[PDB]
Design an enzyme around this catalytic site. Structure first.
Site, PDB file in Angstrom:
ATOM      1  N   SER A 143       0.770  -1.326  -0.150  1.00 50.20           N
ATOM      2  CA  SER A 143      -0.006  -0.063   0.040  1.00 50.20           C
ATOM      3  C   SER A 143       0.913   1.347  -0.128  1.00 50.20           C
ATOM      4  O   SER A 143       1.608   1.382  -0.887  1.00 50.20           O
ATOM      5  CB  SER A 143      -0.857  -0.017   1.041  1.00 50.20           C
ATOM      6  OG  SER A 143      -2.115   0.847   0.809  1.00 50.20           O
ATOM      7  N   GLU A 237     -10.345  -3.801  -5.328  1.00 50.82           N
ATOM      8  CA  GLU A 237      -9.610  -2.948  -4.787  1.00 50.82           C
ATOM      9  C   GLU A 237      -9.986  -1.639  -5.206  1.00 50.82           C
ATOM     10  O   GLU A 237      -9.749  -1.596  -6.635  1.00 50.82           O
ATOM     11  CB  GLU A 237      -8.185  -2.967  -4.684  1.00 50.82           C
ATOM     12  CG  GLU A 237      -7.637  -4.110  -3.899  1.00 50.82           C
ATOM     13  CD  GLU A 237      -6.171  -3.950  -3.602  1.00 50.82           C
ATOM     14  OE1 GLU A 237      -5.628  -2.918  -2.965  1.00 50.82           O
ATOM     15  OE2 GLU A 237      -5.357  -4.897  -3.823  1.00 50.82           O
ATOM     16  N   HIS A 267      -7.527  -5.322  -0.386  1.00 45.94           N
ATOM     17  CA  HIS A 267      -6.140  -4.653  -0.088  1.00 45.94           C
ATOM     18  C   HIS A 267      -5.347  -5.613   0.840  1.00 45.94           C
ATOM     19  O   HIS A 267      -5.870  -6.017   1.782  1.00 45.94           O
ATOM     20  CB  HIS A 267      -6.935  -3.404   0.552  1.00 45.94           C
ATOM     21  CG  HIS A 267      -5.380  -2.443   0.765  1.00 45.94           C
ATOM     22  ND1 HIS A 267      -4.968  -2.124  -0.622  1.00 45.94           N
ATOM     23  CD2 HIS A 267      -5.112  -1.840   1.666  1.00 45.94           C
ATOM     24  CE1 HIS A 267      -3.919  -1.161  -0.200  1.00 45.94           C
ATOM     25  NE2 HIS A 267      -4.123  -1.061   0.989  1.00 45.94           N
TER      26      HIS A 267
END
Length: 295
Positions: A143, A237, A267
């Site tokens: 991320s 996502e 995610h």
């Protein structure tokens, strides 16, 4: 996808870790969730000063001591810690048969951009200084940490530092404006990431800087000369199009890119590998990719 995905989705829809009312509640919330996946007894954790950045060596029995992943945790540049990501770090160490250096890079809002990139580059230069060889190294992150991985490679390249053998991005965040099509079209199936929390954390990280600042938002960075990149992303996502756009940009810059879209995955589904089969499958793929590029 496995029925286990329903259990993870149910957990995330209730915990809503990115929706906590204060930064300290967001930090404590993620630390609480991480305490659920407890560290196997065979994991060796050694705290280290990685050249002015706090870190932890993560070693497992079959860790090749000369192979190192510098791991850059997610959490929007605002949350996450050695504690939140030490389980993902040990799983990667186990799959890649390497050591992992997990760093406590400076977090926003206390330490805005470019503090995170200064810390990641410092830790990488420290690994070289203490005898790690780039041909046996990789940088990986999830991320925000996946965006930081790309920014770290760009900053190292621009400083004439030898780049590692490969890099790995797990659901990377590279568009701090959330203008990807999936930010609208996957909003309904994404139980963790939405535009409002994304923009909240981008604000803390940017502290008024241009949201297309290249080392903050590497969708706008010059990616020429980066080493082979594995991008793993879930099709469920809002950040799907961050990975698609990063792959397009990196390939246009002549980078060897493997884009792996995992059908229906959420995610950083890899973080749930204890309970989610696709999580452990994806980590095994990370290990295979790294071992291939260290051959």
């Amino acid at each position: 996808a496995s029925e286990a995905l329903t259990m993870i989705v149910n957990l995330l829809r209730s915990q809503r870790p990115l929706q906590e009312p204060t930064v300290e509640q967001m930090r404590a919330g993620l630390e609480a969730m991480a305490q659920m996946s407890p560290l196997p007894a065979d994991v060796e954790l050694t705290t280290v000063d990685a050249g002015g950045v706090p870190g932890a060596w993560v070693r497992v029995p079959e860790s090749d001591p000369d192979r190192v992943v510098l791991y850059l945790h997610g959490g929007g540049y605002v949350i996450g810690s050695i504690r939140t990501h030490r389980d993902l770090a040990q799983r990667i160490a186990r799959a890649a048969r390497c050591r992992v250096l997990l760093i406590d890079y400076r977090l926003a809002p206390e330490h805005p951009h470019p503090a995170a990139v200064e810390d990641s580059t410092r830790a990488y230069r420290w690994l070289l200084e203490t005898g790690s060889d780039p041909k046996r190294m990789a940088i990986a992150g999830d991320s925000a940490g996946g965006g930081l991985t790309v920014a770290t490679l760009v900053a190292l390249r621009d400083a004439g530092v030898p780049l590692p053998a490969a890099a790995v991005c797990l659901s990377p965040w590279v568009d701090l404006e959330g203008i990807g099509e999936s930010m609208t079209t996957k909003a309904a199936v994404d139980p963790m990431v939405q535009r409002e929390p994304l923009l909240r954390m981008a604000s803390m990280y940017l502290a008024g800087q241009d949201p297309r600042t290249p080392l903050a938002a590497p969708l706008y960075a010059d990616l020429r000369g980066l080493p082979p990149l594995l991008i793993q992303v879930g099709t469920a996502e809002t950040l799907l199009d961050d990975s698609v756009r990063l792959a397009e940009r990196a390939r246009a810059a002549g980078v060897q890119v493997t884009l792996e879209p995992w059908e229906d995955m959420i995610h950083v589904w890899q973080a749930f590998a204890a309970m989610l089969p696709e999580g452990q499958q994806a980590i095994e793929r990370i290990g295979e990719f790294l071992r291939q590029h260290w051959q």
